[PDB]
């Protein structure tokens, strides 16, 4: 039924004063709305309701209003605890629909990434699998293009990767590509390598090891 669209996330926010996003809808929703603040590790907190009344018991320096399909909110104060995701919802007709989420960033400078290699171990291969890990660290932003090639051949649908959070000191991101590989395929292949590209490098770089 009712579907909500949100402004693109990962917005580059310099340490200034302006901070504005939007949350649109397809069908004309009612005048009343609701905005909430979500924080990780504990229960979320209310932000503003009806776009005309402030929070109850929580001081609010925000300024959010609007009508129809376009709504505008702006915050000027810069506190060290506002960096979180933002959710927008609606209550026009049941069932209700929820947003996806927009997380703000800290405007950290780019860092030069590094690479590493690790051949499979005897104990690892004796279990019935072989995994090679390439360690990626000190890179910005979180978006990166990393792929694997074996014997100068391309493979797909075999890599599972998870990202990490941001530290409270420098907000440094790390990655570690790990793929579980079969022994039979490990025996008949010669060259294993991993390639990474980023804005900090002017030419792709790869590392290879002897089996």
């Amino acid at each position: 039924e009712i579907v909500l669209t949100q402004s693109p996330a990962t917005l580059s926010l310099s340490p200034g004063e302006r901070a504005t996003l939007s949350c649109r809808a397809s069908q004309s929703v009612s005048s009343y709305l609701a905005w909430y603040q979500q924080k990780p590790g504990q229960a979320p907190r209310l932000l503003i309701y009806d776009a005309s009344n402030r929070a109850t018991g929580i001081p609010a320096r925000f300024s959010g209003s609007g009508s129809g399909t376009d709504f505008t909110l702006t915050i000027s104060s810069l506190e060290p605890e506002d960096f979180a995701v933002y959710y927008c919802q609606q209550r026009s007709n049941w069932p209700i629909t929820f947003g996806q989420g927009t997380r703000l960033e800290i405007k950290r400078t780019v860092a030069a990434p590094s690479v590493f290699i690790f051949p499979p171990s005897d104990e690892q291969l004796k279990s019935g699998t072989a995994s090679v890990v390439c360690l990626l660290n000190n890179f910005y932003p979180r978006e990166a293009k990393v792929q694997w090639k074996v014997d100068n051949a391309l493979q797909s649908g075999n890599s599972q990767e998870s990202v990490t959070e941001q530290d409270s000191k420098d907000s440094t991101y790390s990655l570690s590509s790990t793929l579980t590989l079969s022994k039979a395929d490990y025996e008949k292949h010669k060259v294993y390598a991993c390639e990474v590209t980023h804005q900090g490098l002017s030419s792709p770089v790869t590392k290879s090891f002897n089996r």
Partner: protein, 178 residues
């Protein structure tokens, strides 16, 4: 300040007995089980006070001619003062319940248990569909009858209390020149 009702004050006190009868009748009528939170007029038992105060004044004005002493001539000031104070409290509570009905919750006035068991599952202060849709549903549009009934009852109560206070104020001002 023109004194013109002293010689023909028999009717003014004559109507008071049956005015108190109206007050007690309305108080008894309003005590039907209606909701979870009773109005302010329930826990104060004001209608009994008003009815008794009016009927005793009517009994006092039964014999205007001098018959006895210290009973039909001395209490005429305490009676008027207590009636005026009761009327003052009357429209004070009247304006209170007519102002607190269109605004948010102020107090509870929890009802007694004997009426509590009979009507557990309906609220009188506010009924809302809790849903933006289904506005044309009986559970939403089917409170306004009793809402308007209570509003009219309170309005007529206030009007008649004001009239009774006015006539009593005139009567007491006739007795003493301030």
């Amino acid at each position: 300040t023109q004194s013109f009702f002293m010689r023909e004050s028999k009717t003014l006190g004559a109507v008071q007995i049956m005015n108190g009868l109206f007050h007690i009748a309305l108080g008894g009528l309003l005590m039907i089980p209606a909701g979870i939170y009773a109005p302010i007029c329930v826990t104060v038992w004001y209608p009994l006070w008003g009815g008794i105060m009016y009927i005793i004044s009517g009994s006092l004005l039964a014999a205007t001619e001098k018959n006895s002493r210290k009973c039909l001539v001395k209490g005429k000031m305490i009676m008027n003062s207590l009636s005026l104070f009761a009327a003052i409290s009357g429209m004070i509570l009247s304006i209170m319940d007519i102002l607190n009905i269109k605004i948010s919750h102020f107090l509870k006035m929890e009802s007694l248990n004997f009426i509590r068991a009979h009507t557990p599952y309906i609220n009188i202060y506010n009924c809302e569909p809790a849903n933006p849709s289904e506005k044309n549903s009986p559970s939403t549009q089917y409170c306004y009858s009793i809402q308007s009934l209570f509003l009219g009852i309170l309005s007529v109560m206030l009007i008649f209390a004001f009239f009774q206070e006015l006539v009593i104020a005139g009567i007491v001002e006739n007795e003493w020149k301030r």
